[PDB]
């Protein structure tokens, strides 16, 4: 039908790409074998958007899995459902990256990409009709970072009328002391804005934050991020893998979502963070419950999706989406009618009743720009460690093209957030 | 003949098409496999039925109609469901890519490569009518489909078929239902394209049809489902003077003489009674006075507008059902004592009617009440132009930071287009305004 | 009656025309617009070659 091609690179793409194929496994009754043992036809009827259905009626993932540290190939395959994926789609380098951009941008990720590029035209060519691809993947280390915006663009150059989706991992000092990692995330930035049509920030200040302060959690772990992410994941897929009214495909999405090219950088949000439908409609608004650490009372919104999983009155659902939009009109947007679309699916994700997905394209997320910038230019501010990426052959303007397409980017969110009807 | 030829166009123009045709079937009594029992002319003839049905030699009555849509899941459903035989292969076509809400992608990039095939099959159909009266054209304002697609093909067929006559079922976008952010584009852009195309066009907002079957039918959420049923019933009411022949029946065509007084001005709106639950029907008759003034009651409207403000250039009420003329007079005079019903000075006030005696059906396990009596007012009244003012508005607020516009551009559109649809909906609006102003 | 023909026909004419006109200059957009798209991406090309060669240079120290 409408294929997508998933692409996951580096060690956070690929460990949040295996929980992601792990989640929609289990919710579309496929085993780790391949094979289909669900209850429900509804739980087929679009397996072919994430899945190949290879013959003895096993169903494999259309995902190609890419690092420049061979390490990361084995876990995958040492992880539940490591059985699943196509080893063909496995894609190594030996030598790594060392969280340096420029190694997996321009040098070691430039000889490996074409291997990977071979990969997605045989999965792309088999399609009935592709209609696009997502990468999971970081910004903060060297290979999801710079190489991961490689694959971005040399795709893009291939498949130029299809969509280009990433969930990105933005940096935060509460999880990772790398310190180059504000270099990295910008240089990545510099990127996405370009040739990316939808980005979820996926962001791990905010996953910190919630493991921490919600679920009380006092040492998170990557395990701990991740089971946030991929219930974020799950959810914000919902809509392409189930049959639906709303947001069904990657381009609608976009259509609904993205009303300026640049301005694709997206808040998820879930609930409940571990119930009524008035509690999870309050709850998935609010600050505490977003993936991206920014305060959305201190933006307005372009465009929010919300996706409500389980068995609940459609009725309710309706009347509680129109309160929050009139009791919060301040922000959203008065010259983009009808700006949040809300979708309701039957099967609620697993070990849950009821659940919400929330995307917000707010012009809040700035802060989170912000924050990598105050970092970005601290360091830039007295070239630091700059070595470790001229030596790769980058030119010092480069960062500062980079800084300056990112600040661009704020500034145009502020813009929009400025703007009045009158 | 007098054969009309019914296009279906993208999701809610199928839907709605399966909805009319299911509802055809029963109100003829052909069956899913298009044996209709009680016709005795096999593999042809010249009823009524006849101009909305053809007959195969194996006693087939078989629809005069096209479906086509730019994804395959919706037709899918068709060719898999209950009346799958009812039509042959070659009447149901889809792509594999939709037009993604997008007008630009419906009209040229996707559409572009299926409009030859389309224009092909509906030959086909057209090439075995003796008669051919014209086209019935179902689609929405807001989908991508719906939009842009009807729009070339409309442009296609003026150029295939002459003026020969195009009629628009056109679904208006609502809030409550809707799937994209960017409908007001595409309502605009396609009414612009196809002003010129169309001959006379029953806009169906999706909000009217909504809130009826939330205050009339105690149906707590509507689906497309809902809506649809009653979206036929409405369908068939003014179809029904050409698929039925009776004493009292009156053509379509004949109303269209009084309904369009400019060619731009070809908007009717239409008012449908009654609307009522099994629950609530029993016991209780509902005479054809009754009936009749549920037709001023603007709840009652495909449209939401309000013409107590504005001014009648006709008035048609078209009954089906156990009504007589008598009955009708007695309560058009009361209405005319009582109502807010304010004709421009340069037409005449006499409301014309038909009566078609065939009642009214339902489907199975619907919500309407079956009723023995039901009627579909069509009015032209400058109130509907509120229509309009209100989907301007919207397409003023994101038009002016061009919100979503990159979307249109970068399928080949221009800024020009959206400019020219835009000021030929203000020229609309103000043909609505001058229409109604009183002579000198 | 030869005003209706000669109408109906001069109709026909230039709806066939404004559609040829709107269906060539829609290619054309397309195709610009994709074409630059391609062109920006391949200038990323040139200059991730000039940063290898400029690498190949410093490794000559
Ligand atoms: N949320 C989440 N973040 C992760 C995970 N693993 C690594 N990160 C983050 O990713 C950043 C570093 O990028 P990595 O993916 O680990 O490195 P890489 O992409 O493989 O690039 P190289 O290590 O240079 O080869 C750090 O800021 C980490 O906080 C993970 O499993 N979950
Ligand atoms: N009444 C009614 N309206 C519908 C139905 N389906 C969709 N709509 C309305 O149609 C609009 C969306 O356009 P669609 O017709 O669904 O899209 P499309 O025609 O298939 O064109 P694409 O964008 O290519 O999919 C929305 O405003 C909906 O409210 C239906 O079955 N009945
Ligand atoms: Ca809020
Ligand atoms: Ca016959
Ligand atoms: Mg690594
Ligand atoms: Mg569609």
Same mark, same amino acid.
């Given at each position: 039908?409408?294929?997508?091609?998933?692409?996951?690179?580096?060690?956070?793409?690929?460990?949040?790409?295996?929980?992601?194929?792990?989640?929609?496994?289990?919710?579309?009754?496929?085993?780790?074998?391949?094979?289909?043992?669900?209850?429900?036809?509804?739980?087929?009827?679009?397996?072919?958007?994430?899945?190949?259905?290879?013959?003895?009626?096993?169903?494999?993932?259309?995902?190609?899995? &890419?690092? /420049?540290?061979?390490?990361?190939?084995?876990?995958?395959?040492?992880?539940?459902?490591?059985?699943?994926?196509?080893?063909?789609?496995?894609?190594?380098?030996?030598?790594?990256?060392?969280?340096?951009?420029?190694?997996?941008?321009?040098?070691?990720?430039?000889?490996?990409?074409?291997?990977?590029?071979?990969?997605?035209?045989?999965?792309?060519?088999?399609?009935?009709?592709?209609?696009?691809?997502?990468?999971?993947?970081?910004?903060?280390?060297?290979?999801?970072?710079?190489?991961?915006?490689? /694959?971005?663009?040399?795709?893009?150059?291939?498949?130029?009328?299809?969509?280009?989706?990433?969930?990105?991992?933005?940096?935060?000092?509460?999880?990772?002391?790398?310190?180059?990692?504000?270099?990295?995330?910008?240089?990545?930035?510099?990127?996405?804005?370009?040739?990316?049509?939808?980005?979820?920030?996926?962001?791990?200040?905010?996953?910190?934050?919630?493991?921490?302060?919600?679920?009380?959690?006092?040492?998170?772990?990557?395990?701990?991020?991740?089971?946030?992410?991929?219930?974020?994941?799950?959810?914000?897929?919902?809509?392409?893998?189930?049959?639906?009214?709303?947001?069904?495909?990657?381009?609608?999405?976009? &259509?609904?979502?993205?009303?300026?090219?640049?301005?694709?950088?997206?808040?998820?949000?879930?609930?409940?963070?571990?119930?009524?439908?008035?509690?999870?409609?309050?709850?998935?608004?609010?600050?505490?419950?977003?993936?991206?650490?920014?305060?959305?009372?201190?933006?307005?919104?372009?465009?929010?999706?919300?996706?409500?999983?389980?068995?609940?009155?459609?009725?309710? &659902?309706?009347?509680?989406?129109?309160?929050?939009?009139?009791?919060?009109?301040?922000?959203?947007?008065?010259?983009?009618?009808?700006?949040?679309?809300?979708?309701?699916?039957?099967?609620?994700?697993?070990?849950?009743?009821?659940?919400?997905?929330?995307?917000?394209?707010?012009?809040?997320?700035?802060?989170?720009?912000?924050?990598?910038?105050?970092?970005?230019?601290?360091?830039?501010?007295?070239?630091?460690?700059?070595?470790?990426?001229?030596?790769?052959?980058?030119?010092?303007?480069?960062?500062?093209?980079?800084?300056?397409?990112?600040?661009?980017? &704020?500034?145009?969110?502020?813009?929009?957030?400025?703007?009045?009807?009158? | 003949?007098?054969?009309?030829?019914?296009?279906?166009?993208?999701?809610?123009?199928?839907?709605?098409?399966?909805?009319?045709?299911?509802? @055809?079937?029963?109100?003829?009594?052909?069956?899913?496999?298009?044996?209709?029992?009680?016709?005795?002319?096999?593999?042809?003839?010249?009823?009524?039925?006849?101009?909305?049905?053809?007959?195969?030699?194996?006693?087939?009555?078989?629809?005069?109609?096209?479906?086509?849509?730019?994804?395959?899941?919706?037709?899918?459903?068709?060719?898999?469901?209950?009346?799958?035989?009812?039509?042959?292969?070659?009447?149901?076509?889809?792509?594999?890519?939709?037009?993604?809400?997008?007008?630009?992608?419906?009209?040229?990039?996707?559409?572009?490569?299926?409009?030859?095939?389309?224009?092909?099959?509906?030959?086909?159909?057209?090439?075995?009518?003796?008669?051919?009266?014209?086209?019935?054209?179902?689609?929405?304002?807001?989908?991508?489909?719906?939009?842009?697609?009807?729009?070339?093909?409309?442009?296609?067929?003026?150029?295939?078929?002459?003026?020969?006559?195009?009629?628009?079922?056109?679904? @208006?976008?609502?809030?409550?239902?809707?799937?994209?952010?960017?409908?007001?584009?595409?309502?605009?852009?396609?009414?612009?394209?196809?002003?010129?195309?169309?001959?006379?066009?029953?806009?169906?907002?999706?909000?009217?049809?909504?809130?009826?079957?939330?205050?009339?039918?105690?149906?707590?959420?509507?689906?497309?489902?809902?809506?649809?049923?009653?979206?036929?019933?409405?369908?068939?009411?003014?179809?029904?003077?050409?698929?039925?022949?009776?004493?009292?029946?009156?053509?379509?065509?004949?109303?269209?003489?009084?309904?369009?007084?400019?060619?731009?001005?070809?908007?009717?709106?239409?008012?449908?009674?009654?609307?009522?639950?099994?629950?609530?029907?029993?016991?209780?008759?509902?005479?054809?006075?009754?009936?009749?003034?549920?037709?001023?009651?603007?709840?009652?409207?495909?449209?939401?507008?309000?013409?107590?403000?504005?001014?009648?250039?006709?008035?048609?009420?078209?009954?089906?059902?156990?009504?007589?003329?008598?009955?009708?007079?007695?309560?058009?005079?009361?209405?005319?004592?009582?109502?807010?019903?304010?004709?421009?000075?340069?037409?005449?006030?006499?409301?014309?009617?038909?009566?078609?005696?065939?009642?009214?059906?339902?489907?199975?396990?619907?919500?309407?009440?079956?009723?023995?009596?039901?009627?579909?007012?069509?009015?032209?009244?400058?109130?509907?132009?509120?229509?309009?003012?209100?989907?301007?508005?919207?397409?003023?607020?994101?038009?002016?930071?061009?919100?979503?516009?990159?979307?249109?551009?970068?399928?080949?559109?221009?800024?020009?287009?959206?400019?020219?649809?835009?000021?030929?909906?203000?020229?609309?609006?103000?043909?609505?305004?001058?229409?109604?102003?009183?002579?000198? | 009656?030869?005003?209706?023909?000669?109408?109906?026909?001069?109709?026909?004419?230039?709806?066939?025309?404004?559609?040829?006109?709107?269906?060539?200059?829609?290619?054309?957009?397309?195709?610009?617009?994709?074409?630059?798209?391609?062109?920006?991406?391949?200038?990323?090309?040139?200059?991730?070659?000039?940063?290898?060669?400029?690498?190949?240079?410093?490794?000559?120290?």
């Amino acid at each position: 039908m409408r294929e997508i091609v998933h692409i996951q690179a580096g060690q956070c793409g690929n460990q949040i790409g295996a929980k992601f194929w792990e989640v929609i496994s289990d919710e579309h009754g496929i085993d780790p074998t391949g094979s289909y043992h669900g209850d429900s036809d509804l739980q087929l009827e679009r397996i072919n958007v994430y899945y190949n259905e290879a013959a003895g009626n096993k169903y494999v993932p259309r995902a190609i899995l &890419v690092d /420049l540290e061979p390490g990361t190939m084995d876990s995958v395959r040492s992880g539940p459902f490591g059985q699943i994926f196509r080893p063909d789609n496995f894609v190594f380098g030996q030598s790594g990256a060392g969280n340096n951009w420029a190694k997996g941008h321009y040098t070691e990720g430039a000889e490996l990409v074409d291997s990977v590029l071979d990969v997605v035209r045989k999965e792309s060519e088999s399609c009935d009709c592709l209609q696009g691809f997502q990468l999971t993947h970081s910004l903060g280390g060297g290979t999801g970072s710079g190489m991961g915006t490689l /694959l971005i663009s040399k795709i893009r150059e291939e498949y130029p009328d299809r969509i280009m989706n990433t969930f990105s991992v933005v940096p935060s000092p509460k999880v990772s002391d790398t310190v180059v990692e504000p270099y990295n995330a910008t240089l990545s930035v510099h990127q996405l804005v370009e040739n990316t049509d939808e980005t979820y920030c996926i962001d791990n200040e905010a996953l910190y934050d919630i493991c921490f302060r919600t679920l009380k959690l006092t040492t998170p772990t990557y395990g701990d991020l991740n089971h946030l992410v991929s219930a974020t994941m799950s959810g914000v897929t919902t809509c392409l893998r189930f049959p639906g009214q709303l947001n069904a495909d990657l381009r609608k999405l976009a &259509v609904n979502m993205v009303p300026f090219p640049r301005l694709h950088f997206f808040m998820p949000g879930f609930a409940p963070l571990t119930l009524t439908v008035p509690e999870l409609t309050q709850q998935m608004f609010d600050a505490k419950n977003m993936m991206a650490a920014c305060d959305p009372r201190h933006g307005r919104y372009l465009t929010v999706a919300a996706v409500f999983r389980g068995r609940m009155s459609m009725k309710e &659902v309706d009347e509680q989406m129109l309160n929050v939009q009139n009791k919060n009109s301040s922000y959203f947007v008065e010259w983009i009618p009808n700006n949040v679309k809300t979708a309701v699916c039957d099967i609620p994700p697993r070990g849950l009743k009821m659940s919400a997905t929330f995307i917000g394209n707010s012009t809040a997320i700035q802060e989170l720009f912000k924050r990598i910038s105050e970092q970005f230019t601290a360091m830039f501010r007295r070239k630091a460690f700059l070595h470790w990426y001229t030596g790769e052959g980058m030119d010092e303007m480069e960062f500062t093209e980079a800084e300056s397409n990112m600040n661009d980017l &704020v500034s145009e969110y502020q813009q929009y957030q400025d703007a009045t009807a009158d | 003949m007098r054969e009309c030829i019914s296009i279906h166009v993208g999701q809610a123009g199928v839907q709605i098409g399966n909805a009319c045709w299911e509802l @055809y079937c029963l109100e003829h009594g052909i069956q899913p496999d298009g044996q209709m029992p009680s016709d005795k002319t096999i593999g042809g003839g010249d009823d009524s039925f006849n101009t909305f049905f053809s007959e195969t030699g194996a006693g087939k009555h078989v629809p005069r109609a096209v479906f086509v849509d730019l994804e395959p899941t919706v037709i899918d459903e068709v060719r898999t469901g209950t009346y799958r035989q009812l039509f042959h292969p070659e009447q149901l076509i889809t792509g594999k890519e939709d037009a993604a809400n997008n007008y630009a992608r419906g009209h040229y990039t996707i559409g572009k490569e299926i409009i030859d095939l389309v224009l092909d099959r509906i030959r086909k159909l057209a090439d075995q009518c003796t008669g051919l009266q014209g086209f019935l054209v179902f689609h929405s304002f807001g989908g991508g489909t719906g939009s842009g697609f009807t729009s070339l093909l409309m442009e296609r067929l003026s150029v295939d078929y002459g003026k020969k006559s195009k009629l628009e079922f056109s679904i @208006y976008p609502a809030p409550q239902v809707s799937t994209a952010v960017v409908e007001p584009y595409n309502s605009i852009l396609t009414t612009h394209t196809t002003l010129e195309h169309s001959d006379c066009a029953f806009m169906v907002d999706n909000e009217a049809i909504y809130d009826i079957c939330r205050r009339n039918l105690d149906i707590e959420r509507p689906t497309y489902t809902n809506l649809n049923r009653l979206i036929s019933q409405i369908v068939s009411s003014i179809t029904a003077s050409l698929r039925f022949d009776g004493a009292l029946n009156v053509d379509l065509t004949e109303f269209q003489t009084n309904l369009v007084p400019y060619p731009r001005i070809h908007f009717p709106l239409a008012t449908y009674a009654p609307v009522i639950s099994a629950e609530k029907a029993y016991h209780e008759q509902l005479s054809v006075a009754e009936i009749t003034n549920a037709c001023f009651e603007p709840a009652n409207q495909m449209v939401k507008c309000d013409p107590r403000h504005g001014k009648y250039m006709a008035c048609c009420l078209l009954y089906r059902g156990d009504v007589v003329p008598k009955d009708v007079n007695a309560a058009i005079a009361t209405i005319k004592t009582k109502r807010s019903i304010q004709f421009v000075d340069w037409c005449p006030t006499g409301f014309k009617v038909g009566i078609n005696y065939q009642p009214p059906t339902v489907v199975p396990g619907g919500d309407l009440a079956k009723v023995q009596r039901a009627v579909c007012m069509l009015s032209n009244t400058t109130a509907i132009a509120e229509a309009w003012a209100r989907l301007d508005h919207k397409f003023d607020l994101m038009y002016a930071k061009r919100a979503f516009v990159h979307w249109y551009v970068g399928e080949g559109m221009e800024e020009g287009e959206f400019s020219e649809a835009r000021e030929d909906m203000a020229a609309l609006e103000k043909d609505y305004e001058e229409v109604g102003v009183d002579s000198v | 009656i030869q005003k209706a023909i000669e109408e109906n026909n001069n109709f026909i004419k230039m709806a066939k025309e404004k559609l040829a006109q709107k269906m060539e200059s829609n290619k054309e957009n397309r195709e610009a617009h994709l074409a630059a798209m391609l062109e920006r991406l391949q200038e990323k090309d040139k200059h991730a070659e000039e940063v290898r060669k400029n690498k190949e240079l410093k490794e000559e120290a």
